[PDB]
Design a protein around this ligand. Structure first.
Ligand code: ZN
Ligand code: ZN
Ligand code: ZN
Ligand code: ZN
Length: 121
DNA sequence: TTGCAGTGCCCACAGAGGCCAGCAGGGGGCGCTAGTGAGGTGGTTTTTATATGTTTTGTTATGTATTGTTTATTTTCCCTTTAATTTTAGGATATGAAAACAAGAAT
């Protein structure tokens, strides 16, 4: 485990994908990459029978599509609710990240440093 | 009624941001095995140790040989007394040698 861990600092990727440029830190990530070229798909969502490449994708599918009463995530800055955490990530990166050079209002001279305040104005 | 100045509405293509699969990042827990590492047991020999038999060493007793001891028969040194043995006259013998006599021979 520690031998495998040290590549997280160094960056060694001693496992090459013979069919593309990808290179993984350990055996499992390479075996998981192989399904995309071979097209093998061992796992199956038992409810809708929709097809997926990856187990975790299926688990998130079940959680968002065939599950009830699941907790959501509220943006701290704005008042909108959205389902997935990673989409809350992309929301904070595209709308509430600090914009260095600023953006000016289309109709007045006021300049803003966050896209949210701009759209709100 | 119209031209002009200003408004309403409908569309649409952009723009935007949540939705979504895909995919890669670090880390937790299991399936299985090669390869030593060490520890324990068994076998082997072996080595120390012990006991028995044989022989070697030490001690004891008997016989032989050596040294000493008072006899003890030589033996040998020293007397006084004879028994040959020697020496010195003294008389007698003998054998010689002159001496006298007698006998040839010569002058
Ligand atoms: Zn590849
Ligand atoms: Zn499903
Ligand atoms: Zn927000
Ligand atoms: Zn403005």
């Amino acid at each position: 485990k520690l031998k495998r861990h040290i590549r997280s600092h160094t960056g060694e990727r001693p496992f090459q994908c013979s069919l593309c440029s990808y290179a993984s830190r350990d055996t499992y990530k390479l075996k998981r990459h192989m399904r995309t070229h071979s097209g093998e798909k061992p796992y199956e969502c038992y409810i809708c029978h929709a097809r997926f490449t990856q187990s975790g994708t299926m688990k998130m599918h079940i959680l968002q599509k065939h599950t009830e009463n699941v907790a959501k995530f509220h943006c701290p800055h704005c008042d909108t609710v959205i389902a997935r955490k990673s989409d809350l990530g992309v929301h904070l990166r595209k709308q509430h990240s600090y914009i260095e050079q600023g953006k000016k209002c289309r109709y007045c001279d006021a300049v803003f440093h966050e896209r949210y305040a701009l759209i709100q104005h």
